[PDB]
């Protein structure tokens, strides 16, 4: 249930 960051802030997806 982790957040994977593409960039700073809201630039992420959860898996």
């Amino acid at each position: 249930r982790k957040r994977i960051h593409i960039g700073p802030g809201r630039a992420f997806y959860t898996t």
Partner: antibody
Amino acid sequence: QVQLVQSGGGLVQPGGSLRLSCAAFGFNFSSYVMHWVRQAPGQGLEYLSAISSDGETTYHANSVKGRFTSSRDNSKNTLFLQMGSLRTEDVAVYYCARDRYYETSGSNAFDVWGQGTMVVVSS
Amino acid sequence: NSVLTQSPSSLSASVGDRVTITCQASQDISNYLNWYQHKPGKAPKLLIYTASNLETGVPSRFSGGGSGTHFSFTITSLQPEDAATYFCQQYDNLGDLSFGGGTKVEIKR
């Protein structure tokens, strides 16, 4: 000024391959996260992909996940989209965009877009 | 899984008139909504980021507010230049990231 120009659009056979390129002008490309969006005729914008500034970490939407691959070459200031196994639902104007992060609010937007490139899937 | 409903889909108003577009979210998305302008053949343009904030180079004419599930975008004192399509974007995260249906704005003449 700060600008994005897109290339590689055209006609593809159903199931065939096409490579899209997005060139950056007027800004420091390597610092920014990049996105791919598309819009089908008569439909709303649909978000496709994100790629990290270093270019080794990507996100792909479920509609394209194991089909399109986002890549980038920073020494060439170019964002790429490799498209494979194409369908009728992929008929769209394709947009690349520049991500911005607003530290004061911990939030993000697409502050620079390209003029778009059209892809048609047909036999 | 975050569907956004934009209303109205069409819109026609005179120069100098005030007009307001509404966008509704199926989930609490705090303030992570942005508003864009799009003219045909041109590149889409960011006007308002995170509910209420103006991006630089965007005139005071444009305005935004709200939070949670309900959001509003106001163009005060319409100009002939504003004949465009205005669409919103939810950016809670990349996995949910979605767009409104858009509003076609016509200038009444």
